[PDB]
Every structure is written in C-alpha cells, then in structure tokens.
Design a protein around this motif. Structure first.
Motif, PDB file in Angstrom:
ATOM      1  N   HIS A 128     116.587  41.645 -26.782  1.00 51.68           N
ATOM      2  CA  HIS A 128     117.610  42.116 -25.859  1.00 51.68           C
ATOM      3  C   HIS A 128     117.223  41.847 -24.410  1.00 51.68           C
ATOM      4  CE1 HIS A 128     120.792  44.668 -24.226  1.00 51.68           C
ATOM      5  NE2 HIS A 128     119.873  45.290 -23.512  1.00 51.68           N
ATOM      6  N   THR A 129     115.927  41.817 -24.118  1.00 55.28           N
ATOM      7  CA  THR A 129     115.391  41.430 -22.821  1.00 55.28           C
ATOM      8  C   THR A 129     114.768  40.043 -22.915  1.00 55.28           C
ATOM      9  OG1 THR A 129     113.424  42.721 -23.396  1.00 55.28           O
ATOM     10  CG2 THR A 129     115.028  43.743 -21.925  1.00 55.28           C
ATOM     11  N   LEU A 130     114.519  39.447 -21.749  1.00 52.04           N
ATOM     12  CA  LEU A 130     113.879  38.135 -21.716  1.00 52.04           C
ATOM     13  C   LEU A 130     112.476  38.194 -22.307  1.00 52.04           C
ATOM     14  CD1 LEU A 130     114.981  36.858 -18.197  1.00 52.04           C
ATOM     15  CD2 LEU A 130     115.741  36.005 -20.423  1.00 52.04           C
ATOM     16  N   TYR A 131     111.702  39.207 -21.929  1.00 54.43           N
ATOM     17  CA  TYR A 131     110.314  39.341 -22.341  1.00 54.43           C
ATOM     18  C   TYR A 131     110.087  40.680 -23.033  1.00 54.43           C
ATOM     19  CZ  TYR A 131     109.636  35.671 -18.790  1.00 54.43           C
ATOM     20  OH  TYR A 131     109.713  34.519 -18.041  1.00 54.43           O
ATOM     21  N   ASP A 132     108.967  40.758 -23.751  1.00 57.87           N
ATOM     22  CA  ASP A 132     108.390  42.036 -24.145  1.00 57.87           C
ATOM     23  C   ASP A 132     108.037  42.790 -22.871  1.00 57.87           C
ATOM     24  OD1 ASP A 132     106.942  44.220 -25.078  1.00 57.87           O
ATOM     25  OD2 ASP A 132     105.448  43.043 -26.157  1.00 57.87           O
ATOM     26  N   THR A 133     108.887  43.739 -22.472  1.00 57.64           N
ATOM     27  CA  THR A 133     108.685  44.415 -21.195  1.00 57.64           C
ATOM     28  C   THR A 133     107.368  45.184 -21.162  1.00 57.64           C
ATOM     29  OG1 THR A 133     110.161  46.129 -22.057  1.00 57.64           O
ATOM     30  CG2 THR A 133     111.097  44.519 -20.517  1.00 57.64           C
ATOM     31  N   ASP A 134     106.885  45.643 -22.321  1.00 59.63           N
ATOM     32  CA  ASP A 134     105.567  46.270 -22.372  1.00 59.63           C
ATOM     33  C   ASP A 134     104.465  45.261 -22.066  1.00 59.63           C
ATOM     34  OD1 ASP A 134     106.380  48.890 -22.902  1.00 59.63           O
ATOM     35  OD2 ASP A 134     106.500  48.525 -25.064  1.00 59.63           O
ATOM     36  N   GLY A 141      98.295  45.035 -15.043  1.00 58.20           N
ATOM     37  CA  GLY A 141      97.268  46.042 -14.882  1.00 58.20           C
ATOM     38  C   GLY A 141      97.629  47.425 -15.374  1.00 58.20           C
ATOM     39  N   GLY A 142      98.712  47.567 -16.130  1.00 61.99           N
ATOM     40  CA  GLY A 142      99.113  48.849 -16.668  1.00 61.99           C
ATOM     41  C   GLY A 142     100.218  49.562 -15.921  1.00 61.99           C
ATOM     42  N   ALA A 143     100.911  48.885 -15.010  1.00 63.73           N
ATOM     43  CA  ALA A 143     101.984  49.503 -14.248  1.00 63.73           C
ATOM     44  C   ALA A 143     103.030  48.448 -13.924  1.00 63.73           C
ATOM     45  CB  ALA A 143     101.458  50.144 -12.958  1.00 63.73           C
ATOM     46  N   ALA A 144     104.295  48.858 -13.930  1.00 61.74           N
ATOM     47  CA  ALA A 144     105.359  47.929 -13.597  1.00 61.74           C
ATOM     48  C   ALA A 144     105.423  47.710 -12.086  1.00 61.74           C
ATOM     49  CB  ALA A 144     106.703  48.448 -14.099  1.00 61.74           C
ATOM     50  N   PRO A 145     105.765  46.500 -11.650  1.00 63.18           N
ATOM     51  CA  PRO A 145     105.981  46.271 -10.218  1.00 63.18           C
ATOM     52  C   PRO A 145     107.193  47.045  -9.727  1.00 63.18           C
ATOM     53  CG  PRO A 145     105.697  44.198 -11.419  1.00 63.18           C
ATOM     54  CD  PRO A 145     105.924  45.267 -12.438  1.00 63.18           C
ATOM     55  N   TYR A 293     114.987  46.896 -16.183  1.00 63.90           N
ATOM     56  CA  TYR A 293     114.587  47.290 -17.530  1.00 63.90           C
ATOM     57  C   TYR A 293     113.095  47.588 -17.596  1.00 63.90           C
ATOM     58  CZ  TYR A 293     118.610  46.997 -20.644  1.00 63.90           C
ATOM     59  OH  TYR A 293     119.778  47.252 -21.322  1.00 63.90           O
ATOM     60  N   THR A 294     112.281  46.783 -16.911  1.00 63.62           N
ATOM     61  CA  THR A 294     110.839  46.995 -16.931  1.00 63.62           C
ATOM     62  C   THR A 294     110.463  48.297 -16.232  1.00 63.62           C
ATOM     63  OG1 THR A 294     110.527  44.595 -16.939  1.00 63.62           O
ATOM     64  CG2 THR A 294     108.623  45.959 -16.387  1.00 63.62           C
ATOM     65  N   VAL A 295     111.063  48.563 -15.070  1.00 64.46           N
ATOM     66  CA  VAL A 295     110.734  49.775 -14.327  1.00 64.46           C
ATOM     67  C   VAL A 295     111.312  51.002 -15.020  1.00 64.46           C
ATOM     68  CG1 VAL A 295     110.961  50.955 -12.111  1.00 64.46           C
ATOM     69  CG2 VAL A 295     110.568  48.485 -12.181  1.00 64.46           C
ATOM     70  N   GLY A 296     112.551  50.903 -15.505  1.00 63.63           N
ATOM     71  CA  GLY A 296     113.218  52.073 -16.053  1.00 63.63           C
ATOM     72  C   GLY A 296     112.615  52.552 -17.359  1.00 63.63           C
ATOM     73  N   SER A 297     112.204  51.621 -18.223  1.00 66.08           N
ATOM     74  CA  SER A 297     111.661  52.007 -19.521  1.00 66.08           C
ATOM     75  C   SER A 297     110.288  52.657 -19.411  1.00 66.08           C
ATOM     76  CB  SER A 297     111.588  50.790 -20.445  1.00 66.08           C
ATOM     77  OG  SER A 297     110.772  49.773 -19.890  1.00 66.08           O
ATOM     78  N   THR A 298     109.620  52.531 -18.266  1.00 66.23           N
ATOM     79  CA  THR A 298     108.293  53.100 -18.074  1.00 66.23           C
ATOM     80  C   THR A 298     108.286  54.261 -17.091  1.00 66.23           C
ATOM     81  OG1 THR A 298     107.662  51.596 -16.279  1.00 66.23           O
ATOM     82  CG2 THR A 298     107.368  50.818 -18.538  1.00 66.23           C
ATOM     83  N   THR A 299     109.445  54.635 -16.552  1.00 63.69           N
ATOM     84  CA  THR A 299     109.553  55.723 -15.593  1.00 63.69           C
ATOM     85  C   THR A 299     110.257  56.904 -16.241  1.00 63.69           C
ATOM     86  OG1 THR A 299     109.697  54.108 -13.796  1.00 63.69           O
ATOM     87  CG2 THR A 299     110.336  56.383 -13.309  1.00 63.69           C
TER      88      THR A 299
END
Ligand SMILES: Cc1cc2nc3c(=O)[nH]c(=O)nc-3n(C[C@H](O)[C@H](O)[C@H](O)COP(=O)(O)OP(=O)(O)OC[C@H]3O[C@@H](n4cnc5c(N)ncnc54)[C@H](O)[C@@H]3O)c2cc1C
Ligand SMILES: [Cl-]
Length: 488
Positions: A128-134, A141-145, A293-299
């Motif tokens: 559903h996303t371009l990449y494995d967002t994880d 380094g363990g955190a989304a930009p 998607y990257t920021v939201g799924s980890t916040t």
C-alpha cells in the motif's frame, strides 16, 4: 491441500497484489473476501465515499468473475466471521496487504491470533506504501524524519521502491461449491440503498481499479505534462479538467498501486532529463504521501492535538456558530462557500482549494480547531486518509511541520488570480451566476441595483460575510504569535 483466503481491506485491485499472488500459488481453492459491517450506520460517512467503495467492490467482482472466481462480501465483524470460515472452508493460509492504521493494527493482531489457533499461516506483504515504512525508520537510526528535505535524502540513499508485482494468472482457483458461508445471496455486493443511505451520491468520480488505471493512462497521455509537473503552480479553480491527476481516491482505497505509479513516473523521467524534482514533482507528491505515512504510523495520537508529541498545543476557539457556517457553505465568502460545496457534492477538491478552506477555519479567520475541520473532511472526502488528512490539517493550521503563520490566504483575492470571472463560483454557487465578475468575489460590495438585477440580494439570497477578513486575520495572527511564544 491448500485452501487460501485473500482478505481485501485496502488493496482493492488485482495488479501489484503480492498477497493475491501468494494466496493463489499451489492453491486448490481461493476465497477472495471483503468483510462488511452491516451496522456501520448506527453511531460519519457520506454516501459519496461509501458508494465509491461499493463501486470498487463491484469492479473487483467483475475481475474475479472474468477469471472463474467470485468476490465474497461477508457481513459481520472479522473476529466473529473468520473463526467460522476457517473451519468451514478448511483454510490453510490467510493473506492480506499490511496496514499501519491504528484500528488496523488492533484488528489485524486479533485475526493473527485466531488464525494461529486454527492452524492458518498468515502472509502480510507490504504494497500500500512505496516502501516498508518500518525499514525507512530503522535505516534512519530508529526515528522517522520530520522534514521533507531530510526524508527525500533518506529514500535517495535507500534506492528505488520495489517493482510492481506481476499480474495474477488468467484463471483463478475458485471457491469450493456449496459452502454455506459462501452462498451468493449472503455474499453479494450491496447497493447504497440497501445499506441505509437515503440520498444518492453526487460525485463524478467512479470507484474501481478499472477507472484508476484508465485515469492513470490519461495522465500519462502527455509525458511532457508529467515530466514538468509542479504542484504549487496548478490551478485550484479548474473543474472541467482538474489541474492534477485526481488519483487520491484510488490510491486511498488501493484501486491503484503506488508502486506502479512510481514505476511509470521513472519511465518518463529517464526520457525527460529536465523533469521536475521533489517536492513539487509528481514523484514528489507520492513522497508526500509516503512521508506522512512514515511519520504518522510511528507517532502516537497523530490524529489528535492532545497526546500528540509533534503537534503544538494551541488554545483554539470552541465556536459552533462559525463551524456551522463554514461546514454549511454559508460564510459569505463565495470562494470559500464554492469550495465547501465542491466538498459535499464531489468529495474532492484541488490541494490549494483545501488550503483555502482549511486556513480560513483555523489560523486564518475563524480560529476553530483543525480537529473539527478534519471531522468535516473525514465525512465527505472520497479520498479521506487517516494519516494524510491529519498531517495536512496540522500543516495548514501551523500546528505541525509548517510554522509560517504570517502567510494568510485571502478568501477574496486568492481565487481571483486564477479565475477572475468566477467560473468556479458560478458552477458551485448558482445563486451568484448572474453577478458581474467585478463583484462575484465580494458580492456585498455590489450596489443594491446590481444585486437586484442579478437576482442575488446579500442578506436574503446569499449571506453577508460572517467576518471581516482584515480584522479576523489580524486577530488570528496575533493569537498564533502568542501561542508560539508560550510553547517553547
Ligand atoms: C487540509 C487538507 C487535508 C487533506 N486531506 C487529504 C486526505 O485525506 N487524503 C488525501 O489523499 N490527500 C489529502 N490532502 C492532500 C491533497 O489535497 C490531495 O492529496 C490532492 O488534492 C489529491 O489530488 P490529486 O490526486 O490530483 O493529487 P496529485 O497532485 O495528482 O498527487 C498525486 C498523489 O500524491 C499524493 N499527494 C498529493 N499531495 C499530497 C499531500 N499534500 N499530502 C499527501 N499526499 C499527497 C496523493 O496520493 C495524490 O493522489 C489534503 C490536503 C489538505 C490541505
Ligand atoms: Cl493571498
């Protein structure tokens, strides 16, 4: 023997569907399933989007029928329906496209444990996303930009996204015959009437993978347009032919693969060396979606103000009267009311049109919380995306990502630079169709004789403006500057 279920939630498509490909391999029977809650309208969803979903299911149905199979629309909740059909159908494998939404995580984790007890292997590919967002977070380094510039340099080091998966076979392993839960009378695609909606949809955009691929090929008819696309330079007032792709509803539901889109863009970029670059390019637009998607799924608490570690705590006003006028397209500013009318009728507006109405409600004029505006967008937008709606609402209200609160759109001048004759306004506000162009953005400034002749008297046929933008925007900027000082 192998009997498999391919569970559709998003990913409502046959192209670039690795979950479908795995389900079909070495399978004796495949059960394509969508789970529908028949009481979703008991306690939110406009008929425009729900019918868009139903049209997407009917398109999937015709695609499976063309391959000797059938889409089963099961009524109930997944935690109650799957334990039964696992035993009844002799399921050995359950495949579905991975999803990172909050409820998706709770729902999917429950289905995982039920499959485990039933001896069912679970395969959940990412598509559903371009990449494995994880993977993107782990590589950083363990955190989304938190900025687009930093995110774009990250994906550049990571490389291109995976290529789209091959097409499914021309013939599919069908569901077993005479299974009671697969009975056609209880597994058909409902109409909007049968689910309880009383008002018919008015949107002009039809759901389905077929429509998505048709719109994709239309966008790529002119590779010069694709190559030189620059998002901030597109026309928000263009409605006969929208200035952007309008692929957001199909990407939201997964009728269109983001990886196929990205792959098609690379094919054009390599023959057009002067093509636009991120963030303004068309590829950059998909990277905006990937970024949020990257920021939201980890916040945590990403869709709310409270508990959200990336959202500024602003003392927004609780004013139901301003929200009602904004929500009901009766602010007295024709540009705003026309766009709010496009929202309820079409369920889609151009990005800069969304800017105008979002800025107006929040940090620009009315100073109502962006959560209330998101609630209104979440009902009517056919492309409503939990992560994208929330991120852009925080952007426009200067609560996250964006901080330049001195930049305030004028509900009078903004649209005039694109559409001086107000064609967009006459289309969606027919009560102003006869108003001379000199006054169509400011109908209260028109002399009374002109209002009478035009059949639109301000105060009787079209409301007066609920605020003075000069006074209201000055009050909102002074308040945002104080909120920005107290939150250090
Ligand atoms: C307040 C507000 C709320 C929004 N709510 C949503 C929402 O719920 N769902 C949604 O899909 N977009 C949302 N957006 C983004 C933007 O308005 C739409 O994605 C865009 O208008 C869709 O038109 P398009 O398909 O022609 O986009 P194009 O310019 O053709 O871009 C192609 C694709 O890139 C993605 N994209 C484009 N712009 C953005 C963006 N700013 N952020 C994230 N992804 C983007 C979308 O998937 C879009 O389909 C919102 C914008 C605002 C200001
Ligand atoms: Cl402006």
């Amino acid at each position: 023997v192998k009997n498999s279920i391919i569970w559709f939630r998003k990913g409502l498509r046959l192209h670039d569907n690795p979950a479908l490909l795995e389900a079909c391999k070495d399978a004796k029977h495949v059960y394509p399933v969508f789970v529908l809650d028949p009481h979703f309208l008991q306690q939110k969803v406009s008929v425009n989007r729900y019918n868009f979903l139903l049209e997407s299911l009917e398109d999937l149905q015709r695609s499976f029928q063309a391959r000797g199979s059938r889409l089963l629309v099961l009524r109930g909740k997944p935690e109650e329906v799957f334990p039964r059909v696992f035993r009844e159908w002799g399921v050995t494998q359950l495949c579905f496209e991975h999803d990172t939404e909050p409820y998706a995580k709770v729902r999917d984790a429950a289905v995982r444990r039920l499959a485990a007890e039933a001896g069912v292997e679970v395969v959940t590919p990412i598509s559903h996303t371009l990449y494995d967002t994880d993977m993107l977070v782990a590589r950083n380094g363990g955190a989304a930009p938190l900025t687009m510039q930093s995110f774009t340099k990250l994906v550049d080091r990571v490389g291109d996204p995976p290529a789209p998966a091959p097409d499914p076979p021309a013939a599919m392993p069908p569901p077993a015959e005479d299974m009671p839960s697969a009975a056609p009378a209880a597994t058909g695609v409902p109409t909007w009437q049968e689910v309880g909606f009383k008002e018919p949809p008015l949107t002009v955009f039809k759901g389905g993978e077929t429509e998505a691929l048709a719109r994709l090929e239309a966008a790529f008819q002119d590779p010069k347009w694709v190559a030189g696309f620059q998002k901030p330079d597109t026309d928000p007032s263009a409605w006969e032919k929208p200035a952007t792709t309008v692929l957001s509803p199909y990407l939201k539901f997964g009728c269109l693969s983001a990886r196929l889109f990205h792959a098609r863009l690379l094919e054009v970029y390599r023959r057009h060396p002067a093509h636009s670059q991120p963030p303004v390019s068309l590829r950059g637009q998909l990277l905006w979606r990937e970024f949020f998607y990257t920021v939201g799924s980890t916040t945590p608490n990403f869709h709310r103000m409270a508990g959200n570690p990336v959202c500024k705590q602003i003392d927004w006003d609780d004013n139901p009267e301003f929200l009602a006028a904004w929500r009901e397209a009766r602010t007295g500013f024709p540009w705003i009311d026309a766009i709010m009318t496009q929202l309820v009728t079409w369920g889609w507006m151009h990005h800069l049109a969304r800017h105008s109405v979002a800025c107006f409600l929040t940090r620009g004029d009315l100073y109502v919380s962006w959560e209330r505006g998101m609630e209104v967008f979440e009902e009517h937008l056919i492309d409503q995306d939990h992560y994208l709606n929330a991120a852009n609402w925080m952007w426009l209200s200067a609560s996250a990502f964006f901080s330049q609160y001195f930049r305030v759109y004028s509900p009078v001048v903004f649209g005039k630079k694109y559409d001086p004759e107000g064609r967009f306004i006459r289309k969606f506000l027919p009560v102003l169709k006869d108003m001379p162009a000199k006054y169509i953005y400011e109908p209260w400034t028109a002399p009374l004789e002109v209002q009478r002749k035009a059949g639109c008297v301000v105060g009787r046929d079209y409301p007066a403006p609920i605020v003075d933008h000069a006074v209201a925007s000055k009050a909102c900027i002074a308040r945002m500057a104080a909120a920005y000082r107290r939150s250090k």
